[PDB]
Amino acid sequence: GRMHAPGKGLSQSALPYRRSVPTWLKLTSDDVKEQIYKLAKKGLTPSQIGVILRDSHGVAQVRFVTGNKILRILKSKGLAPDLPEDLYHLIKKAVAVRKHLERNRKDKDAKFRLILIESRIHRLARYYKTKRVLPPNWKYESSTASALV
Amino acid sequence: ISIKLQEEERERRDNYVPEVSALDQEIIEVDPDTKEMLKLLDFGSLSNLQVTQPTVGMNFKTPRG
Amino acid sequence: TSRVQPIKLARVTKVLGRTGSQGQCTQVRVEFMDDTSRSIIRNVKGPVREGDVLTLLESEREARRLR
Amino acid sequence: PLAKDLLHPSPEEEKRKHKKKRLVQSPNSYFMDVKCPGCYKITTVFSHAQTVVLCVGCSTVLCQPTGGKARLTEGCSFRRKQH
Amino acid sequence: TKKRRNNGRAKKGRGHVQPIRCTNCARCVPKDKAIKKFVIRNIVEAAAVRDISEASVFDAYVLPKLYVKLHYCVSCAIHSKVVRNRSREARKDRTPPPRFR
Amino acid sequence: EDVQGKNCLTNFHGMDLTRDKMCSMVKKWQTMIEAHVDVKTTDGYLLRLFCVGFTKKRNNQIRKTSYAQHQQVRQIRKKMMEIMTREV
RNA sequence: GCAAGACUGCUAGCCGAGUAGUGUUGGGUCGCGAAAGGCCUUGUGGUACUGCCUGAUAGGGUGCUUGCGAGUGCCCCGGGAGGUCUCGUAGACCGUGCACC
RNA sequence: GCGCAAGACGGACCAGAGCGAAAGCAUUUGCCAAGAAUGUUUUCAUUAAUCAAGAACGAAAGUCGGAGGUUCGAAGACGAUCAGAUACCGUCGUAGUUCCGACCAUAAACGAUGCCGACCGGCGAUGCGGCGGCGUUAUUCCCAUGACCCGCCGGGCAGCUUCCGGGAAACCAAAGUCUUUGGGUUCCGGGGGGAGUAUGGUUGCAAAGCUGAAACUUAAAGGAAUUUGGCGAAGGGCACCACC
Numbered sequence A: 001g002r003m004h005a006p007g008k009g010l011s012q013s014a015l016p017y018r019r020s021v022p023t024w025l026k027l028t029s030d031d032v033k034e035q036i037y038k039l040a041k042k043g044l045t046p047s048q049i050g051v052i053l054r055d056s057h058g059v060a061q062v063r064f065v066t067g068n069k070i071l072r073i074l075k076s077k078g079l080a081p082d083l084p085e086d087l088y089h090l091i092k093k094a095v096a097v098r099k100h101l102e103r104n105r106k107d108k109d110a111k112f113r114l115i116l117i118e119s120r121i122h123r124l125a126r127y128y129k130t131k132r133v134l135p136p137n138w139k140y141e142s143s144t145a146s147a148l149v
Numbered sequence B: 001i002s003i004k005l006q007e008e009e010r011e012r013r014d015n016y017v018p019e020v021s022a023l024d025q026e027i028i029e030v031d032p033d034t035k036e037m038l039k040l041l042d043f044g045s046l047s048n049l050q051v052t053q054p055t056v057g058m059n060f061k062t063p064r065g
Numbered sequence C: 001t002s003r004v005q006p007i008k009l010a011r012v013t014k015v016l017g018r019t020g021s022q023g024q025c026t027q028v029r030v031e032f033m034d035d036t037s038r039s040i041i042r043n044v045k046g047p048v049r050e051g052d053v054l055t056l057l058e059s060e061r062e063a064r065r066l067r
Numbered sequence D: 001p002l003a004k005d006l007l008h009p010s011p012e013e014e015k016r017k018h019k020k021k022r023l024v025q026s027p028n029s030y031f032m033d034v035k036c037p038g039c040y041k042i043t044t045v046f047s048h049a050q051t052v053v054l055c056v057g058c059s060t061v062l063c064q065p066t067g068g069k070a071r072l073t074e075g076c077s078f079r080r081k082q083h
Numbered sequence E: 001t002k003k004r005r006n007n008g009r010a011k012k013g014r015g016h017v018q019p020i021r022c023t024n025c026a027r028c029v030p031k032d033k034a035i036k037k038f039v040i041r042n043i044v045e046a047a048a049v050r051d052i053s054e055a056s057v058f059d060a061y062v063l064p065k066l067y068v069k070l071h072y073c074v075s076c077a078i079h080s081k082v083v084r085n086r087s088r089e090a091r092k093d094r095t096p097p098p099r100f101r
Numbered sequence F: 001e002d003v004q005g006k007n008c009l010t011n012f013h014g015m016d017l018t019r020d021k022m023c024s025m026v027k028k029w030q031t032m033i034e035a036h037v038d039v040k041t042t043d044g045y046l047l048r049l050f051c052v053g054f055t056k057k058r059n060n061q062i063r064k065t066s067y068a069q070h071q072q073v074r075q076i077r078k079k080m081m082e083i084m085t086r087e088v
Numbered sequence G: 001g002c003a004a005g006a007c008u009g010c011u012a013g014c015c016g017a018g019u020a021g022u023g024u025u026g027g028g029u030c031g032c033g034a035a036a037g038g039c040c041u042u043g044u045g046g047u048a049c050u051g052c053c054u055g056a057u058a059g060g061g062u063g064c065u066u067g068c069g070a071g072u073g074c075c076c077c078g079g080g081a082g083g084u085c086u087c088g089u090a091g092a093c094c095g096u097g098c099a100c101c
Numbered sequence H: 001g002c003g004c005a006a007g008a009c010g011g012a013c014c015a016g017a018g019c020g021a022a023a024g025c026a027u028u029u030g031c032c033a034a035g036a037a038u039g040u041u042u043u044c045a046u047u048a049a050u051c052a053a054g055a056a057c058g059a060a061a062g063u064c065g066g067a068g069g070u071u072c073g074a075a076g077a078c079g080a081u082c083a084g085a086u087a088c089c090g091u092c093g094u095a096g097u098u099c100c101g102a103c104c105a106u107a108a109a110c111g112a113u114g115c116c117g118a119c120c121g122g123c124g125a126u127g128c129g130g131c132g133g134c135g136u137u138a139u140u141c142c143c144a145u146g147a148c149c150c151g152c153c154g155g156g157c158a159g160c161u162u163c164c165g166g167g168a169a170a171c172c173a174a175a176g177u178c179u180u181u182g183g184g185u186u187c188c189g190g191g192g193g194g195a196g197u198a199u200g201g202u203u204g205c206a207a208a209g210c211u212g213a214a215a216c217u218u219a220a221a222g223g224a225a226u227u228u229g230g231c232g233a234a235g236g237g238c239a240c241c242a243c244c
Helices: A031-040 A044-058 A070-077 A085-101 A108-130 B008-015 B032-041 E047-053 E074-079 F019-025 F070-086
Strands: C008-019 C026-034 C041-043 C052-054 D031-033 D040-044 E019-021 E028-030 E035-042 E065-072 F031-038 F048-055
Touching: A031 A044, A031 A070, A031 E065, A044 A070, A044 D040, A085 A108, B008 F031, C008 C041, C026 C052, C026 E019, C041 C052, F019 F048, F031 F070
Parallel strands: none
Antiparallel strands: C008 C026, C008 C052, C026 C041, D031 D040, E019 E028, E035 E065, F031 F048
């Protein structure tokens, strides 16, 4: 089932079998790349950018209207951050958990979920280090929150 | 017990027969759903077949628990 | 007590099972002629048939078990 | 039972069961076209609009996010479109 | 061996329940294991309600009731004949006996 | 609090209910709702209004449970808060 | 523009008029709902009921007759005849113990 | 009967209901933080339930320093009971039972059943979220909403039945897919005592936890289940050698 939860779960997206640009869509690839660039100038994470372009522009998904995906074209444009959004959200959650934690000393399950989430970011950081994303001299401890958020 | 004269006292009642056939009534109460069931199979709307007025706004399965 | 209450007399309808420590008194359903609708269950000692009538002193208490 | 024609099912069982255990993978969602009665243009929105949506020109709000589908503003016409 | 499907209680996904003291006894029996009695009774018994009725200032005055809940330990339940024992296949019966009196 | 001779003058001090009625109101397979506000009148009278609430099974309901969600209970309780704030 | 079908609100002649006033959870184009003053076919037939409150001859809550159950009945007014309504039966507890082997 | 003060606890509502890794969790309100499941034509693209070293949490009782000590209550005192009670019973009753922090890591911590994944019957209800579909209600007209009803989907606590199949049988939708043996992966048991004992190491203020023998003795110790048997166990039937 889950990785730190004992509950089985079946809730995920299922892409259709059809691989074609829809006929009712009258939008090419260069212009949709232009509003991806504009929403990148807005400065948001690629997941909510993708769901809002699908939501408010009626496109099925980007990967069939252009040749590649959005993280590829942001790292081609160079505006994409070096730190991935998964570790960004998870270390923001860790900062919030510790910021709740030091005021309330008698909080055991918050500490338990804290230990679970540095275990999670360590297991993700090993994969991004062996995939040549993070530098090999990068380290994490509980006292590094001002340098990376 | 077992009978060999086939119990004449109601055997003669079996020989007694109503003049009506007890199924060939002047009209037959037919719901629209079984009407459109029989309509697709072999026979459409007949003279003996009538449409039940919908009194089905209240449901079934009286409460038990 | 200390109340002058009149004597009401009653007529039997059905005989029922008999209670008691040794099993001597019989529960009987019985009813009045001056008010036919109201019927009462009373404890009676002795052999009772159907068709007779019974003399009763109190119409206030209710029959119960062996104690 | 034991004998079911798994190759060519009747349509009611793959509109009956869950999407992930169908014979072929097909989602249960779709794209929707909605317009305002006070406006003129027709925008294209998802079935699960997931956020607040506003048309260009700032005329009105089309629909609100809800954990199921989107709850549309009243009076707006809609047509089930397919590709 | 195992006697019942459950263990004389109703603990399925908890592992711990609040105990409540018995009435006749003083045992710290849990809520799901103990037998609970909710009796419906009037203020007085049945052979005096008429004697109350002619002794009342009011006319057609309704007699109030008492609504109490009794918590019974299993030893106090078997000692007071509240619940009896059954056979092997007779224990496969969840429904209560019919209330006739 | 006021006597002069062969008379005693009374005043409202509190309202209660019989134990038998409130014991008749509590039953299983229903949700009990409690709501109390400390309120003040136009004069210097400080009150405390206790109220109870018991759900109603529908006449065509087949469910024996007939419960309600927690936030529905919170909304009903807040409605009781604003009602007994308004009327006193 | 042409085609005839199917259903419904309201009224029992129509305007006034669904103006006022009332309330609801959220709204709407809105429910309830007469009158003053009037003008004219000068004002539709059959059909059963009806415990109490709320809110409609609906809905909701709640009774009486004999303990129970099934029938029967429970709007207002005026006359007559009656006076013990009919049918079948659990409606059971209700002072009671218990050392030491 | 009228008030004041202190401490403890949140009954009835309260279920073979919910949540949590487990211990465990119930007066209202506010603040902070986390999470399951549902939905997704959103993002990353193999990032994995598997785990000695190591680490967190952990019922009650036990220890240490502080104010509080209502009620209950180990040892102790008294009186009955008994042939004999420093036992069952009754009245007081210290430490504790209550809070903050510092400890220990033991339970029948038991579903007496490790974790993940797949497959193999049906039925009726429950909780969450979503979905479709007559009708009633927040009074009468129109829409979304809450309430109710009829169906579907996924997850969860659960129930009934059986020649699916298994087992020694109790019984099992897992305790099945096992000689017609092999999905992956930790811990752990070779008759019964001796004995979780001695020694050693280990941690602990203490109480003590973990690791953990040998000599010698025994042919039994044990698990399921059937029939009179015995209850200071329940229920029923009969008897003028029992009663009324």
